Amino acid sequence: FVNQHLCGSHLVEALYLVCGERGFFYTPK
Amino acid sequence: GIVEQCCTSICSLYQLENYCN
């Protein structure tokens, strides 16, 4: 699921799945 | 940033993990 174009909710989902209990930051700006 | 790397271009695990805490 990671090796594709990932935008919006799709990108946030990928971050969520990859980062797990660490969490993540989503900074589109 | 992440949009340029993963939305406009093709993402990778290596790049996604740069945004984990």
From Swiss-Prot, chain B:
Disulfide bonds join C6-C11. This is Insulin A chain. The chain holds residues 90 to 110 of 110 of the full protein.
